């Protein structure tokens, strides 16, 4: 299986697997059952921004979701990523729909990773930023139903010509180049990622969510990881 760490923007509450009785954002450490959640006033049809940050000094992974002139949902969990992930991973976005649907459109996505080795200023870094997505976006790995070029956005899941979302759909996007997320002789390792999304639901019942994830280099969409599994895990364990 794949090692997965993710911050999920869960739009549908499945209490059968531990979901809070309402929209929430959470931190998953190898399990769809979040280790920490936080109510989230999901604003259907509006563009929102998501900020995820981490550093090895605090060893605390944090995230904030917000909409303009609206409030901010915050969640944080303490986790040493050196024990959970391999030093070489890949990053990306995942999202799904099941019985109910929603558009999981990504308007922009940027990321930045930094390594300060224990030899002073042995700083290595990686940075990418997407505000436009081309039809043929060669630096991205598209798995499942994810596509690009549409109005310059990334559609992680199925959406018809009429612009309405589809049910039972799974799609992800990963950056082409592997990322050195941590090293032993490292004094401070940190990364921060941002992305704007537009979750729209005509049927008024949104599902299932969008997620930012970190996995092993060769991570692929798991069987039946559609709907409530956010295309991240193979079972609700």
């Amino acid at each position: 299986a794949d090692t997965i760490v993710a911050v999920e923007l869960d739009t549908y509450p499945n209490t059968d697997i531990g979901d809070p009785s309402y929209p929430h954002i959470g931190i998953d450490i190898k399990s769809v059952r979040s280790k920490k959640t936080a109510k989230w006033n999901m604003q259907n049809g509006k563009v929102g921004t998501a900020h995820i940050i981490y550093n090895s000094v605090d060893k605390r992974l944090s995230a904030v979701v917000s909409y303009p002139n609206a409030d901010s949902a915050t969640v944080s969990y303490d986790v040493d990523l050196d024990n959970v992930l391999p030093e070489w991973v890949r990053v990306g976005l995942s999202a799904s729909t099941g019985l109910y649907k929603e558009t999981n459109t990504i308007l922009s996505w940027s990321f930045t990773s930094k390594l300060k080795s224990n030899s002073t200023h042995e700083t290595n870094a990686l940075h990418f930023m997407f505000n436009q997505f081309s039809k043929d976006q060669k630096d991205l790995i598209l798995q499942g139903d994810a596509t690009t070029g549409t109005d310059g956005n990334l559609e992680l899941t199925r959406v018809s010509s009429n612009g309405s979302p589809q049910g039972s759909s799974v799609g992800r996007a990963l950056f082409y180049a592997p990322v050195h997320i941590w090293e032993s002789s490292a004094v401070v390792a940190s990364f921060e990622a941002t992305f704007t999304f537009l979750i729209k639901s005509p049927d008024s019942h949104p599902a299932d969510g969008i997620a930012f994830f970190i996995s092993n280099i060769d991570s692929s969409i798991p069987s039946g990881s559609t709907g409530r599994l956010l295309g991240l895990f193979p079972d609700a364990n």
């Binding site: 929209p23 006033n41 604003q43 049809g45 609206a70 005509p202 949104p206």
Partner: peptide, 12 residues
């Protein structure tokens, strides 16, 4: 184009 389908939209 869409209005508070379900999730509580604070404001409009």
């Amino acid at each position: 184009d869409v209005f508070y389908p379900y999730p509580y939209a604070s404001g409009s």
